[PDB]
Amino acid sequence: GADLTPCAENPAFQALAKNARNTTADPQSGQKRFERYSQALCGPEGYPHLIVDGRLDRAGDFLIPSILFLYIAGWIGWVGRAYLQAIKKDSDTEQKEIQLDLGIALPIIATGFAWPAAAVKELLSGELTAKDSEITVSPR
Amino acid sequence: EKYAITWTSPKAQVFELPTGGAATMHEGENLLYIARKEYGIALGGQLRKFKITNYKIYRILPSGETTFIHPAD
Amino acid sequence: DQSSYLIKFISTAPVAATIWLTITAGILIEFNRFFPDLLFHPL
Amino acid sequence: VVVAFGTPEKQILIEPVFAQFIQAAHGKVLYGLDTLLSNPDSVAYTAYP
Amino acid sequence: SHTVKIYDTCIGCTQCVRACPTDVLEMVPWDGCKAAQVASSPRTEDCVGCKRCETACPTDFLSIRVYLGAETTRSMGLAY
Amino acid sequence: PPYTFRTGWALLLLAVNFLVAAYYFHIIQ
Amino acid sequence: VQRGSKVRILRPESYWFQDVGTVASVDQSGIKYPVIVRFDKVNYAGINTNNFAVDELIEVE
Ligand code: CLA
Ligand code: CLA
Ligand SMILES: CC1=C(/C=C/C(C)=C/C=C/C(C)=C/C=C/C=C(C)/C=C/C=C(C)/C=C/C2=C(C)CCCC2(C)C)C(C)(C)CCC1
Ligand SMILES: CC1=C(/C=C/C(C)=C/C=C/C(C)=C\C=C\C=C(C)\C=C\C=C(C)\C=C\C2=C(C)CCCC2(C)C)C(C)(C)CCC1
Ligand code: SF4
Ligand code: SF4
């Protein structure tokens, strides 16, 4: 519910299939999305309602893009983390922040694809975090 | 009137009044009646670019009492 | 060396972030001309 | 943007399936979850002892 | 008026005396620091709460502090 | 140390999170 | 300590509390805070040096 009968059976989804608007200048981009959206669940309105539950017949809504995003997003953090680990042991480190040391940034970018193999390695070695006696804090 | 400021100038030249506008000091001892002590130090620093460090801010009470308050010595 | 100043200028903050976000945005645009309307993964 | 471009089916619409359940775990037949005071065979529906 | 507290951590930089525009502050000799003088505020009835004196002090944290108190005519900055 | 009192109550609350989902997945009825 | 020794700060009101400094010079008699520590990161005022007592520091080298 509410009335999540599948889109292939709907009078409303088939009525929205007759006045299709072409997305791209492909002359049948209007048709080649409605047959693709037929396996989803359109309510009374005629629009596919995504299911973020974790059901495996509905894994394409949220389950598949979640693994796809968190690989790419934990990448960008890990690349930006491991670069800042490198430049701290240099001559200046503030020039290499605005003005990128391209000779050092490019090995870090290629390294990244074992970041789950590296973050768990950094976690269990106790080198992910820092000590609370070594971070500046505000007076209580 | 309150807080007279006096200074001795080597010559005459155009300065900037703290009350807004430009006047012309005399040669010798000058005298300017201002409203507050904040004007006299903001004027006293404008004298420093004229190489004058002989300025004295008084305090003229309405009874007629004139108290020398800058410097202390 | 005049050529080293062009590598050192192409790797400042707004110049690298203009090129990298142009390559990033161009990948999303040319992926969406050919494979449009991807609301969810079709399984 | 998706509605403005005349193709409103590309909306990202999520059913609130975790509050769909509570209203059906309080006895609403309208969604057909069939649990917990909407399931007439339930232990909570009958108060078994 | 306001209240100007000067702690014992300053170095005799004379940046706070050269910044208070009503000339509240002055240097007195004091055998503690390297420059052998501490700032003192003997004329706090003239202080206008400007906090130029807190802006110019080097030491962390500030050796000089202005506590904003009861506001008379001299501390409101009224020409009238 | 292995935090027994912290993880003892977190696993109790997470067992409540998994029990309600068993009603929602029709595992328990 | 000596000119070049990394120390730490325990003064709570200071900006560089529990941070690593570098002693630039230690004085002899007066002030009570005779240790100049040249820090590497700046506070809100923009400076990166301060004076500290002898017992205020924690040597880490
Ligand atoms: C090196 C990149 C990097 C990394 C690994 C992190 C990591 C973290 N940040 Mg942070 N942050 C960063 C950059 C980064 N930040 C920058 C540049 C900003 C300014 C916009 C912020 C602003 C920020 C805020 C306001 C907050 C965090 C928070 C957090 C924590 C949770 C993750 C999160 O909420 O993301 C937050 C991410 C953003 C707000 C935007 C991301 C910024 C850009 C898009 C990514 C940077 C990529 C980098 C430039 C690439 C350089 C590559 C190098 C080789 C040249 C985590 C410790 C949160 C926290 O404290 O949680 C406990 C939090 O509240 N951060
Ligand atoms: C911090 C984020 C946050 C917050 C405060 C809320 C708050 C709320 N959600 Mg919501 N939700 C969130 C994130 C969040 N949500 C995410 C990420 C999803 C998945 C798309 C959902 C999906 C969702 C549904 C389907 C429903 C709610 C509902 C609600 C409301 C009732 C409480 C409830 O069911 O909690 C739900 C809380 C969670 C499911 C997770 C708690 C937050 C987690 C820990 C954040 C991390 C999630 C992580 C990124 C996902 C990993 C993906 C995985 C596949 C790898 C409440 C307003 C209900 C509603 O609309 O009532 C009217 C409802 O039915 N939420
Ligand atoms: C001067 C300067 C600067 C600035 C600059 C700027 C700011 C720029 C901007 C730029 C921009 C803002 C950009 C944009 C981009 C765009 C894009 C990226 C696009 C793309 C497109 C496409 C790719 C297309 C395609 C196609 C075709 C061709 C045909 C039809 C179909 C389609 C549509 C698909 C800086 C700062 C650096 C530095 C200094 C100097
Ligand atoms: C399944 C599912 C679900 C659920 C979920 C949950 C509820 C979860 C939880 C979870 C949790 C509750 C978690 C937490 C966490 C925490 C923490 C603590 C974390 C950690 C992190 C870190 C530490 C980080 C790191 C990093 C990385 C990784 C990368 C980048 C860089 C950095 C450094 C940032 C939902 C229903 C929604 C949907 C469907 C499915
Ligand atoms: S209070 Fe500030 S300006 Fe005055 S002597 Fe101390 S450090 Fe110098
Ligand atoms: S209140 Fe502050 S700014 Fe004003 S004179 Fe006194 S110390 Fe200087």
XYZ file of C-alpha atoms and ligand atoms in Angstrom:
701
model
C 0.000 0.000 0.000
C -1.129 2.546 -0.711
C -2.316 0.805 -3.894
C 1.164 -0.276 -4.993
C -0.070 -2.510 -7.774
C 2.698 -2.831 -10.404
C 2.949 -0.303 -13.191
C 2.294 -2.752 -16.041
C -1.300 -3.258 -14.833
C -2.283 0.374 -14.256
C -4.773 2.277 -16.399
C -2.970 5.392 -15.155
C 0.555 4.307 -16.109
C -0.662 3.286 -19.562
C -2.448 6.623 -19.925
C 0.834 8.367 -19.097
C 2.490 6.142 -21.713
C 0.526 7.610 -24.629
C 1.623 11.258 -24.279
C 5.327 10.603 -23.790
C 7.832 13.437 -23.828
C 11.170 12.575 -25.420
C 13.986 13.079 -22.929
C 16.890 13.233 -25.405
C 16.685 13.777 -29.217
C 16.487 9.996 -29.560
C 12.990 9.867 -31.130
C 11.945 6.924 -28.931
C 13.429 8.096 -25.637
C 9.801 8.761 -24.762
C 9.014 5.074 -25.133
C 12.220 3.468 -23.848
C 11.681 4.595 -20.266
C 8.082 3.462 -19.733
C 8.770 -0.166 -20.595
C 11.743 0.110 -18.248
C 9.575 1.554 -15.469
C 6.980 -1.217 -15.774
C 8.553 -3.430 -13.116
C 8.367 -0.681 -10.501
C 5.354 0.122 -8.337
C 3.068 2.949 -9.445
C 0.420 4.019 -6.960
C -2.927 5.607 -7.795
C -1.163 8.557 -9.421
C 0.809 6.649 -12.035
C 4.297 7.343 -10.718
C 6.799 4.682 -9.587
C 7.171 4.740 -5.801
C 10.624 3.588 -4.749
C 11.070 1.079 -1.938
C 14.030 1.735 0.349
C 13.196 -1.261 2.574
C 15.888 -3.677 1.439
C 13.630 -6.190 -0.306
C 15.592 -8.011 -2.974
C 12.896 -7.704 -5.634
C 13.236 -3.939 -5.035
C 17.027 -3.817 -4.724
C 17.394 -1.488 -7.707
C 15.853 1.508 -5.944
C 18.099 1.937 -2.924
C 20.216 -1.186 -2.343
C 22.183 -1.082 -5.621
C 22.857 2.725 -5.595
C 23.884 2.601 -1.921
C 26.845 0.302 -2.563
C 27.577 2.320 -5.706
C 27.591 5.630 -3.845
C 29.473 4.589 -0.705
C 32.311 3.179 -2.789
C 32.665 6.499 -4.617
C 32.075 8.709 -1.582
C 34.433 6.866 0.741
C 36.930 7.076 -2.114
C 36.946 10.886 -2.192
C 37.361 11.083 1.554
C 40.193 8.552 1.557
C 42.043 10.296 -1.272
C 41.619 13.637 0.469
C 42.702 12.072 3.750
C 45.830 10.328 2.485
C 47.034 13.432 0.641
C 46.861 15.518 3.830
C 48.796 12.760 5.590
C 51.569 13.179 3.021
C 51.973 16.944 2.821
C 52.231 17.442 6.598
C 55.760 16.003 6.511
C 57.022 18.558 3.973
C 58.835 21.896 3.898
C 55.847 24.275 4.008
C 52.469 22.322 3.691
C 50.412 25.503 3.172
C 51.552 26.033 -0.412
C 50.739 22.385 -1.186
C 47.141 22.997 0.028
C 46.024 25.748 -2.380
C 48.660 24.964 -5.038
C 48.468 21.235 -5.533
C 51.614 19.136 -5.483
C 50.647 17.226 -8.617
C 53.597 14.856 -8.218
C 52.181 13.680 -4.882
C 48.428 13.988 -5.492
C 48.476 11.608 -8.485
C 49.943 8.520 -6.705
C 47.287 8.946 -3.992
C 44.458 9.004 -6.551
C 45.526 5.728 -8.178
C 46.044 4.052 -4.783
C 42.503 4.336 -3.610
C 40.611 1.215 -4.690
C 41.747 -0.770 -1.673
C 40.473 1.863 0.765
C 38.148 -0.677 2.507
C 41.219 -2.884 2.704
C 43.130 0.144 3.999
C 40.552 1.730 6.331
C 39.997 -1.542 8.190
C 43.792 -1.874 8.307
C 44.002 1.666 9.695
C 41.163 0.939 12.125
C 42.637 -2.201 13.669
C 46.119 -0.670 13.913
C 44.708 2.246 15.901
C 46.025 4.776 13.384
C 42.617 5.898 12.122
C 41.842 8.124 15.098
C 43.924 10.358 17.348
C 44.433 10.605 21.082
C 42.201 12.909 23.103
C 45.279 14.154 24.957
C 46.708 15.383 21.632
C 43.709 17.314 20.239
C 43.029 20.888 21.293
C 39.794 21.305 23.254
C 37.702 24.178 24.529
C 37.649 25.061 28.245
C 34.669 23.324 29.802
C 33.066 74.608 27.291
C 35.192 71.743 28.607
C 38.582 70.065 27.965
C 40.752 72.801 26.504
C 43.761 71.585 24.515
C 46.861 73.749 24.079
C 49.875 73.166 21.862
C 52.890 75.170 20.727
C 53.541 75.152 17.017
C 56.771 76.032 15.179
C 54.828 77.724 12.361
C 51.369 77.925 10.779
C 49.855 75.037 8.803
C 46.453 73.585 7.968
C 45.306 70.704 10.151
C 42.018 68.818 10.467
C 39.613 69.664 13.279
C 38.157 66.691 15.197
C 34.706 68.268 14.884
C 34.899 67.965 11.084
C 36.603 70.429 8.766
C 40.025 72.005 8.359
C 41.366 74.986 10.311
C 44.752 76.716 10.421
C 46.869 76.811 13.565
C 48.836 79.913 14.463
C 52.544 80.059 15.107
C 53.146 79.706 18.821
C 50.716 78.702 21.545
C 47.324 77.508 20.326
C 44.027 76.815 22.047
C 41.022 74.761 20.969
C 37.807 74.184 22.894
C 36.518 70.702 22.100
C 33.649 68.668 23.488
C 35.334 65.523 24.843
C 38.759 64.129 25.730
C 38.399 61.606 22.883
C 38.713 64.529 20.444
C 41.915 65.773 22.059
C 43.861 62.553 21.730
C 42.532 62.000 18.205
C 43.839 65.502 17.560
C 46.987 64.839 19.599
C 47.929 62.001 17.282
C 47.288 64.213 14.267
C 49.894 66.576 15.748
C 52.403 63.706 15.820
C 52.702 63.697 12.045
C 53.458 67.431 12.358
C 56.267 66.493 14.823
C 54.577 68.186 17.796
C 54.550 66.448 21.200
C 53.836 69.403 23.486
C 50.060 69.134 23.823
C 48.159 69.538 27.097
C 44.510 68.588 27.618
C 42.812 70.463 30.457
C 39.377 69.902 32.015
C 37.242 73.041 32.295
C 34.410 72.452 34.758
C 31.335 74.742 34.606
C 32.350 76.268 37.952
C 35.571 77.529 36.365
C 37.910 74.780 37.587
C 40.622 73.807 35.092
C 42.196 70.431 35.902
C 45.357 69.387 34.055
C 44.745 65.731 33.175
C 47.240 64.937 30.391
C 50.129 64.197 31.065
C 50.250 63.274 34.746
C 53.748 64.640 35.447
C 61.932 27.309 -17.336
C 58.763 28.935 -18.641
C 56.969 25.611 -19.114
C 57.148 24.686 -15.415
C 55.109 27.779 -14.535
C 52.221 26.423 -16.607
C 52.146 23.098 -14.754
C 52.411 25.095 -11.535
C 49.527 27.351 -12.629
C 47.287 24.497 -13.797
C 47.529 23.017 -10.282
C 46.344 25.944 -8.181
C 42.985 25.853 -6.389
C 40.434 27.371 -8.836
C 42.136 26.115 -12.005
C 42.403 22.462 -11.004
C 38.890 22.543 -9.553
C 37.570 24.066 -12.777
C 39.105 21.346 -14.952
C 38.314 18.464 -12.592
C 34.698 19.544 -12.135
C 34.425 19.971 -15.912
C 35.610 16.406 -16.523
C 33.303 15.285 -13.695
C 30.281 17.131 -15.088
C 31.036 16.018 -18.641
C 30.980 12.364 -17.607
C 27.505 12.789 -16.101
C 26.274 14.648 -19.182
C 27.587 12.219 -21.795
C 26.353 9.288 -19.717
C 22.872 10.823 -19.773
C 22.623 11.447 -23.509
C 23.061 7.745 -24.275
C 21.486 6.099 -21.212
C 18.778 8.490 -20.010
C 15.979 8.185 -17.464
C 17.814 5.878 -15.026
C 15.539 6.215 -12.014
C 16.617 2.881 -10.521
C 18.739 -0.114 -11.399
C 16.638 -2.473 -13.549
C 17.933 -5.766 -11.982
C 13.082 20.111 -12.318
C 11.615 16.759 -13.379
C 8.018 18.012 -13.290
C 9.016 21.304 -14.958
C 10.504 19.406 -17.893
C 7.146 17.745 -18.540
C 8.311 14.238 -17.557
C 6.992 13.878 -13.986
C 7.461 10.086 -13.849
C 11.181 10.608 -13.169
C 10.338 11.771 -9.626
C 12.071 10.101 -6.687
C 9.053 9.014 -4.634
C 9.561 6.898 -1.517
C 6.688 5.224 0.283
C 7.041 5.670 4.061
C 7.197 1.903 4.576
C 8.294 2.175 8.213
C 5.239 4.226 9.167
C 3.030 2.250 6.797
C 3.741 -0.657 9.128
C 2.815 1.067 12.404
C -0.581 2.104 11.082
C -1.074 -1.494 9.974
C 0.357 -2.700 13.297
C -2.428 -0.669 14.899
C -5.207 -2.120 12.783
C -5.569 -0.460 9.381
C -6.584 -2.952 6.696
C -6.081 -0.365 3.923
C -2.458 -1.276 3.195
C -2.628 -5.062 3.534
C 0.421 -5.644 5.716
C -1.603 -8.110 7.863
C 0.228 -7.902 11.194
C -0.407 -7.121 14.825
C -4.129 -6.226 15.368
C -4.716 -6.222 11.621
C -3.842 -9.919 11.549
C -6.894 -11.541 13.200
C -4.794 -14.642 14.000
C -2.242 -12.658 15.979
C -1.371 -13.153 19.621
C -1.601 -9.380 20.062
C -4.999 -9.315 18.355
C -6.525 -11.988 20.568
C -4.658 -11.362 23.872
C -4.115 -15.094 24.130
C -4.177 -15.946 27.894
C 32.351 53.436 34.366
C 33.914 50.305 32.926
C 36.525 48.056 34.542
C 40.012 47.473 33.136
C 41.776 44.448 34.628
C 45.429 43.912 33.729
C 46.863 40.496 34.522
C 50.504 39.660 35.162
C 51.163 37.956 31.830
C 51.978 40.948 29.639
C 55.459 41.749 28.431
C 55.445 45.542 28.434
C 54.741 45.734 24.711
C 53.244 49.275 25.019
C 50.759 48.470 22.255
C 47.740 48.820 24.526
C 48.799 52.220 25.880
C 49.323 53.473 22.314
C 45.809 52.369 21.328
C 43.382 53.470 24.056
C 41.989 56.716 22.616
C 40.955 58.301 25.911
C 44.425 57.588 27.408
C 43.316 55.399 30.286
C 46.433 53.256 30.228
C 49.989 54.021 31.275
C 53.175 52.070 31.906
C 54.556 51.666 35.415
C 57.912 49.993 36.171
C 57.661 46.400 37.347
C 60.597 44.017 37.800
C 58.752 40.974 36.416
C 58.865 40.928 32.630
C 61.746 41.275 30.190
C 60.895 44.879 29.284
C 60.513 45.545 33.049
C 57.188 47.386 32.860
C 53.516 46.470 33.148
C 50.481 48.298 31.822
C 48.327 50.042 34.411
C 44.894 51.690 34.192
C 44.681 54.518 36.753
C 42.010 56.496 34.862
C 39.228 53.994 34.222
C 36.538 56.649 34.656
C 37.564 57.842 31.181
C 37.318 54.435 29.502
C 34.695 54.242 26.779
C 34.655 50.468 26.374
C 36.315 50.689 22.956
C 38.301 47.422 23.369
C 41.066 48.773 21.172
C 43.305 47.848 24.094
C 42.247 44.201 23.944
C 42.752 44.097 20.171
C 46.359 45.323 20.328
C 47.639 43.062 23.120
C 49.847 40.212 21.845
C 49.694 37.697 24.671
C 47.473 34.621 24.547
C 45.213 34.859 26.307
C 44.805 38.619 26.820
C 46.577 40.242 29.733
C 44.211 43.212 29.563
C 40.445 42.883 29.773
C 37.635 45.438 29.717
C 34.558 44.541 31.753
C 31.598 46.591 30.571
C 29.914 48.201 33.574
C 27.567 51.070 34.406
C 27.522 53.653 31.636
C 27.860 57.309 32.642
C 28.141 60.302 30.304
C 31.893 59.974 29.771
C 31.612 56.298 28.818
C 28.629 56.700 26.488
C 30.648 58.997 24.244
C 28.083 61.794 24.234
C 29.072 65.275 23.110
C 25.774 66.577 24.512
C 39.106 -2.939 27.589
C 36.260 -4.867 25.960
C 33.418 -2.597 27.019
C 30.991 -5.093 28.520
C 28.451 -2.688 30.002
C 28.283 -0.480 26.896
C 27.985 -3.320 24.371
C 25.652 -5.209 26.699
C 22.929 -2.583 26.376
C 23.611 -1.760 22.723
C 23.040 -5.406 21.798
C 19.870 -5.375 23.902
C 18.499 -2.354 22.033
C 19.593 -3.746 18.665
C 17.775 -6.974 19.515
C 14.659 -4.822 19.870
C 15.406 -3.296 16.443
C 15.598 -6.794 14.934
C 12.507 -8.098 16.729
C 10.168 -5.425 15.347
C 11.561 -6.028 11.852
C 10.651 -9.704 12.246
C 7.015 -8.631 12.565
C 7.481 -6.429 9.507
C 9.119 -9.245 7.508
C 6.510 -11.791 8.757
C 9.192 -13.954 10.373
C 7.288 -13.889 13.680
C 3.499 -13.644 13.876
C 64.295 23.484 27.956
C 66.533 24.260 24.960
C 66.292 26.005 21.604
C 64.527 23.441 19.426
C 62.721 21.191 21.923
C 59.149 20.215 21.077
C 56.901 20.880 24.082
C 53.199 20.713 24.873
C 50.874 23.215 26.513
C 48.667 22.672 29.551
C 47.347 26.231 30.021
C 43.574 25.911 29.445
C 42.913 29.528 28.487
C 45.652 29.375 25.842
C 44.796 28.751 22.206
C 47.372 26.016 21.656
C 46.139 23.837 24.525
C 47.388 20.230 24.161
C 49.329 21.131 21.009
C 52.967 20.705 20.028
C 55.199 23.764 20.108
C 58.883 24.512 19.631
C 60.945 26.366 22.221
C 62.667 29.358 20.647
C 64.433 30.834 23.697
C 64.389 30.404 27.471
C 65.162 33.390 29.681
C 66.973 33.369 33.024
C 65.416 35.566 35.738
C 62.026 37.132 35.064
C 59.310 36.954 33.756
C 57.661 34.118 35.732
C 56.770 32.794 32.227
C 60.276 32.851 30.702
C 59.874 30.332 27.846
C 59.279 31.589 24.305
C 57.559 28.869 22.271
C 57.348 29.405 18.510
C 54.221 27.545 17.452
C 53.519 26.403 13.911
C 49.809 27.259 13.606
C 48.365 30.698 14.323
C 45.630 31.765 16.718
C 42.751 34.112 15.956
C 44.982 37.138 16.512
C 47.314 35.844 13.806
C 50.405 35.421 15.993
C 52.234 32.165 16.665
C 54.453 32.862 19.689
C 53.774 33.095 23.409
C 55.440 32.971 26.822
C 55.002 30.060 29.225
C 56.155 28.996 32.665
C 58.770 26.322 33.290
C 56.318 23.844 34.844
C 53.690 24.642 32.213
C 55.287 22.545 29.486
C 55.520 18.824 28.732
C 58.671 17.850 26.860
C 58.077 15.278 24.108
C 61.619 14.988 22.719
C 39.724 15.755 2.673
C 38.394 15.796 2.620
C 37.549 15.655 3.766
C 37.314 14.568 4.563
C 37.835 13.211 4.501
C 36.343 15.003 5.593
C 35.870 14.175 6.615
C 34.904 14.536 7.521
N 34.207 15.705 7.608
Mg 34.677 17.376 6.469
N 34.998 19.049 5.267
C 35.901 19.113 4.248
C 36.707 18.039 3.786
C 36.752 16.786 4.308
N 36.038 16.316 5.427
C 35.853 20.421 3.619
C 36.677 20.853 2.499
C 34.843 21.127 4.252
C 34.417 22.500 3.961
C 33.230 22.555 3.031
C 34.307 20.257 5.287
C 33.236 20.570 6.129
C 32.718 19.741 7.089
C 31.562 19.987 7.961
C 30.817 21.232 8.006
C 31.352 18.813 8.648
C 32.398 17.878 8.211
C 32.255 16.573 8.779
C 33.140 15.563 8.501
C 33.123 14.150 9.070
C 31.960 13.320 8.520
C 31.826 13.201 7.011
C 30.963 14.308 6.505
O 29.970 14.768 7.050
O 31.374 14.892 5.341
C 31.089 16.305 5.260
C 31.405 16.773 3.893
C 31.100 18.001 3.451
C 30.414 18.999 4.297
C 31.445 18.428 2.071
C 32.675 17.723 1.535
C 33.717 18.712 1.061
C 34.246 18.376 -0.327
C 33.116 18.198 -1.316
C 35.090 17.115 -0.295
C 36.556 17.448 -0.169
C 37.383 16.722 -1.206
C 38.800 17.273 -1.271
C 38.811 18.750 -1.592
C 39.615 16.516 -2.304
C 41.080 16.853 -2.185
C 41.900 15.791 -2.873
C 43.389 16.078 -2.786
C 44.177 14.934 -3.381
C 43.704 17.344 -3.545
C 34.477 13.576 8.612
C 35.478 13.624 9.727
C 31.028 16.651 9.659
C 31.319 16.251 11.072
O 31.946 16.891 11.912
O 30.803 15.044 11.429
C 31.274 14.429 12.627
C 30.552 18.124 9.628
O 29.655 18.542 10.337
N 33.257 18.466 7.385
C 19.837 10.761 10.164
C 18.953 10.557 9.191
C 17.533 10.364 9.298
C 16.582 10.855 10.163
C 16.664 11.762 11.300
C 15.291 10.261 9.751
C 14.091 10.518 10.415
C 12.896 9.893 10.151
N 12.617 8.963 9.198
Mg 14.053 8.306 7.845
N 15.430 7.529 6.497
C 16.751 7.863 6.469
C 17.411 8.771 7.340
C 16.828 9.467 8.350
N 15.460 9.468 8.676
C 17.418 7.133 5.414
C 18.838 7.239 5.111
C 16.452 6.346 4.806
C 16.637 5.432 3.680
C 16.252 6.077 2.374
C 15.199 6.602 5.490
C 13.977 5.975 5.207
C 12.812 6.158 5.910
C 11.499 5.520 5.711
C 11.186 4.536 4.694
C 10.672 6.036 6.672
C 11.473 6.985 7.447
C 10.714 7.648 8.455
C 11.276 8.577 9.283
C 10.597 9.265 10.458
C 10.292 8.274 11.584
C 11.464 7.532 12.217
C 12.017 6.361 11.459
O 11.419 5.450 10.895
O 13.378 6.374 11.393
C 13.963 5.691 10.270
C 15.437 5.740 10.430
C 16.262 4.993 9.681
C 15.759 4.073 8.647
C 17.739 5.022 9.824
C 18.236 5.896 10.950
C 19.337 6.800 10.448
C 20.519 6.025 9.899
C 21.318 5.448 11.038
C 21.416 6.930 9.081
C 22.363 6.128 8.223
C 21.626 5.418 7.111
C 22.609 4.903 6.076
C 23.234 6.053 5.330
C 21.939 3.963 5.090
C 22.915 2.908 4.623
C 22.435 2.256 3.348
C 22.779 0.778 3.311
C 21.927 0.063 2.285
C 24.247 0.590 2.997
C 11.656 10.259 10.950
C 11.214 11.652 10.654
C 9.314 7.109 8.339
C 8.343 8.161 7.919
O 8.331 8.767 6.853
O 7.378 8.440 8.830
C 6.288 9.261 8.409
C 9.359 6.021 7.258
O 8.405 5.313 7.044
N 12.725 7.040 7.012
C 39.243 32.988 -16.145
C 39.771 32.165 -15.041
C 39.014 31.359 -14.295
C 37.573 31.244 -14.507
C 36.955 30.398 -15.337
C 35.586 29.949 -15.144
C 34.885 30.296 -13.891
C 35.123 28.987 -15.948
C 33.796 28.421 -15.942
C 33.555 27.369 -16.727
C 32.279 26.688 -16.790
C 31.218 27.105 -15.861
C 32.222 25.523 -17.442
C 31.051 24.904 -18.001
C 31.134 23.629 -18.402
C 30.111 23.046 -19.229
C 30.069 21.750 -19.560
C 30.949 20.780 -18.887
C 29.283 21.343 -20.700
C 29.264 20.117 -21.233
C 28.422 19.897 -22.382
C 28.282 18.742 -23.042
C 29.180 17.599 -22.813
C 27.438 18.725 -24.217
C 27.177 17.631 -24.934
C 26.135 17.573 -25.964
C 26.374 17.873 -27.241
C 27.690 18.327 -27.714
C 25.371 17.811 -28.323
C 23.971 17.746 -27.784
C 23.895 16.710 -26.705
C 24.783 17.093 -25.544
C 24.023 18.155 -24.790
C 24.889 15.894 -24.631
C 39.624 30.566 -13.180
C 38.780 30.718 -11.932
C 39.652 29.077 -13.486
C 41.086 30.893 -12.902
C 41.605 32.203 -13.435
C 41.223 32.355 -14.883
C 20.420 -1.630 6.003
C 19.402 -0.629 5.626
C 19.026 0.398 6.402
C 19.577 0.615 7.744
C 20.753 1.181 8.046
C 21.209 1.426 9.403
C 20.235 1.880 10.415
C 22.522 1.576 9.595
C 23.166 2.052 10.793
C 24.478 2.280 10.744
C 25.213 2.989 11.770
C 24.514 3.433 12.988
C 26.480 3.329 11.521
C 27.262 4.252 12.296
C 28.545 4.452 11.976
C 29.386 5.144 12.910
C 30.704 5.292 12.765
C 31.540 5.644 13.929
C 31.277 5.279 11.442
C 32.591 5.276 11.200
C 33.115 6.128 10.163
C 34.382 6.552 10.112
C 35.204 6.660 11.326
C 34.814 7.295 8.949
C 35.943 7.053 8.280
C 36.133 7.477 6.888
C 35.841 6.676 5.860
C 35.283 5.324 6.044
C 36.012 7.036 4.437
C 36.315 8.495 4.233
C 37.291 8.985 5.260
C 36.717 8.829 6.647
C 37.857 9.075 7.610
C 35.699 9.939 6.803
C 17.961 1.336 5.916
C 16.673 1.054 6.660
C 18.271 2.806 6.163
C 17.739 1.226 4.421
C 17.632 -0.196 3.944
C 18.900 -0.937 4.270
S 48.406 44.226 28.641
Fe 48.965 43.857 26.463
S 49.684 45.880 25.727
Fe 49.669 46.003 27.995
S 51.782 45.419 28.604
Fe 50.568 43.507 28.657
S 50.859 42.607 26.581
Fe 51.535 44.768 26.438
S 38.112 50.992 27.342
Fe 39.603 49.743 26.153
S 39.848 50.894 24.202
Fe 38.868 52.331 25.663
S 40.614 53.453 26.590
Fe 40.172 51.699 27.976
S 41.565 50.058 27.244
Fe 41.499 51.616 25.587
